[PDB]
Amino acid sequence: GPLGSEAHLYMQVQIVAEDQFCGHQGNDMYDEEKVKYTVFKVLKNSSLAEFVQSLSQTMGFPQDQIRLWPMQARSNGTKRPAMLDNEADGNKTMIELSDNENPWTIFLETVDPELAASGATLPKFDKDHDVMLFLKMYDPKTRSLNYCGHIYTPISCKIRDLLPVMCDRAGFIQDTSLILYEEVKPNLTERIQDYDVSLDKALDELMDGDIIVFQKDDPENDNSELPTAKEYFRDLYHRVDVIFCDKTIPNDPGFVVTLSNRMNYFQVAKTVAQRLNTDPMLLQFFKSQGYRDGPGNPLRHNYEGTLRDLLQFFKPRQPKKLYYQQLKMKITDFENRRSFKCIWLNSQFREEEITLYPDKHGCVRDLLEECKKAVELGEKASGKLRLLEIVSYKIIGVHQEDELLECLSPATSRTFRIEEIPLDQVDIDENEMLVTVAHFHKEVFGTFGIPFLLRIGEHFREVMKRIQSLLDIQFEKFKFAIVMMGRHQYINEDEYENLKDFEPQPGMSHPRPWLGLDHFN
């Protein structure tokens, strides 16, 4: 197998009965993915007569009680029943008549089963002089379409004389005043301005399978949200049901919101904000793909496209799904956040990588405030944070809170560290100053580990002991050096005791000298 050797000789013919036309709410006769067909697997090269008998027997109708009107497409995209001569074209074969359509859909007309009792012949129909029209009634109150069947009429017939049949089929008295529209194609519903005209003249390109939609001309209709059929169809054309799914909870079933093609961001957001009883500005939406399955990129609030634009990557088959996320601040604030990767130095003196999101137009104070939120600050401490700029495991700076985050280097050789200020280092005095410190192995530029700030000048060995307490090693080695411009002097850890050695000798302000700690790894 699997495909059998004769499978090619066969084509598929899809019969559709008039019952399938009933209660269709859209354009044309039926919806292609909802309609129930009676399907035949017929020999391609076989004739129409053969098929009409086969069909006649299968469906239980005499042949003089059925007429086949193939469903054919039009240039403008619609698909309507078209005339086919069941006796002139009967000699021909099925792919011929089909024009190689596979599958081929045919509308099967039969006789009003009541009158089918009598042995009712199906009315004669002249291919050149008559037309078969379909009737739909539009009801504003329920905003719905009610199928009213089809009629054979001469094309010479004046539209006025069609009115009684339309009433009779809708359920109306004969005094009932009507509005008549031609359903031409989606988004085109044309009012018949004048009913004292022949069909031939009144409608451009009069054709079998044409549709007249009609409604009551009752002043009540103005209370409907869609008073006329024209408004109904125009609404339909832009209607679109969209699944909104929270990007916070994966495998969210989401909820379906009916919207318009036409809507802008403000309108969409406004609509999905109700149904959540949340503010629209407290929602962030995301662009999409459709097959690739998003959520794509965050969609800006200043967005200026329509909803049709966001769903242009959907094929008509796929169900439309847009992702969203609930917010805690106004969307515009959230959008103006900046990603700030940096290092937090906990109370336990260890490093953690943390990303904070202060405001783009923020200053250092703000970044600090943000950090204080993500971290426990150690008990009985100081409660005050500072920001350091670090290069090569050396503190090359301490930033003031005033400073706009805008100014700080985007450079990635640079490393920003946020730390709690030890208690001693804020009620600091002349007799007192803060100095930069760093590890290094062998030569002074082989720096490593974690730099830090310290109290500097009337001793030493207890410095070594306090630095011991801070570092918490166990270190008997480790030489100690002051490091200034192109030079560094080691420190006698038994005898040495300092001053304000640590400052630019008058000849230039920075880089300030530092104290270095010489040992391995």
Residues 170 and 249 in one domain: no
| For the chain, the helix, strand and coil percentages under 3-state DSSP, each to the nearest 5 | 20, 35, 50
Residue 108 contacts residue 146 (beta carbons within 8 Å):
no
- Backbone region of residue 333 per phi and psi (left: phi > 0; alpha: psi in -120 to 50; beta: other values): alpha
Q: Closest Cα partner for 107 from 127, 82, 134? A: 82
* C-alpha–C-alpha distance, residues 260 and 401, integer Å: 49
Give the DSSP H/E element, type plus range, for residue 230.
helix 229-238
Provide the residue range defining the domain that includes 248: 237-334
Residue 328 sits in the same domain as residue 231: no
Q: How many CB atoms lie within 10 A of CB 232?
A: 24
Residues 514 and 483 sit within 8 Å (Cβ to Cβ): yes
What does the block give as tokens for 104?
Answer: 């081929």
DSSP bridge partners of 152: 132
Q: How many residues does the chain have?
A: 521
What distance, in Å, lies between the first and last C-alpha atoms of the chain? 71
Which pair of tokens denotes residue 150?
């089809």
Name the structure determination technique: X-ray
Query: How many angstroms is the resolution?
Result: 3.0
Residue 250's alpha-carbon distances to 245, 319, 323, 414, in angstroms, are 9, 18, 11, 37
What is the CATH number for 254? 3.10.20.90
Residue type for position 271: T
**Cα torsion angle, 22, 26, 29, 33, sign:** negative
Which among 447, 449, 424 has a CA at the least distance from the CA of 434? 424
- Region class of 369: left (phi > 0), else alpha (psi between -120 and 50), else beta: alpha
Q: Which residues contact 18 (CB under 8 A, 6 or more apart)?
A: 107, 108, 109, 110, 149, 150
Q: Give the position of tokens 């008509």.
A: 316
Question: Quick one: 215 and 255 in the same domain?
Answer: no
Which of 232, 145, 136 is CA-nearest to residue 189? 232
CA distance 207 to 227: 28
Q: Half-sphere exposure (CA, 13 Å, Cβ side) for 135? A: 22
Q: Compute the distance between CA of residue 284 and CA of residue 282 in angstroms, rounded to an integer.
A: 7
286 and 227 both lie in a single domain? no
Separation CA 247–CA 323 (nearest Å): 6
Q: Which helix (H) or strand (E) holds 132?
A: strand 130-139
- What letter represents residue 4's amino acid? G
Q: Cα(354)–Cα(421) distance, rounded to whole angstroms?
A: 18
* Shared-domain flag, residues 195 and 276: no
**Does the N-terminal peptide bond of residue 295 adopt cis geometry, omega within 30 degrees of 0?**
yes
Residues contacting 13, CB < 8 A, separation 6+? 39, 40, 42, 51, 94, 103, 104, 105, 106
- Contact between 70 and 97 (Cβ < 8 Å): yes
Closest CA relative to residue 466, chosen from 454, 457, 477: 454
CA distance 145 to 28: 12
What gap in Å lies between CA 26 and CA 24, rounded to an integer?
6
Give CA–CA dist 439/324, Å, rounded.
49
Residue 47's identity, in one-letter code, is S
**Residue 379, token pair as written in the block:** 């008990």
DSSP string of 9-77?
TEEEEEEEEGGGGTT--SSSSS-TTTPPPEEEEEETTSBHHHHHHHHHHHHT--GGGEEEEEEEE-TTS
* Mode of pairing for the β-strands spanning 320-326 and 239-246: parallel
| Angstrom distances, CA of residue 289 to CA of 223, 304, 315, 319 | 40, 18, 11, 12
Provide CB contacts within 8 A for 43, sequence distance 6+. 9, 10, 11, 94
Q: Tell me the pairing of strands 210-216 and 178-185.
A: antiparallel
224 and 267 co-located in one domain: no
The answer on 259 and 321 residing in a single domain is yes
Contact of 81 with 71, CB cutoff 8 Å: yes
Nearest CA to 278 among 304, 306, 246, 243? 246
Instruction: Please check whether residues 201 and 139 belong to one and the same domain.
Output: yes
| Parallel, antiparallel or unpaired: strands 79-81 and 66-73 | antiparallel
Is residue 179 located within the same domain as residue 271? no
270 and 327 together in one domain: yes
Mark whether 245 and 287 lie in a shared domain.
yes
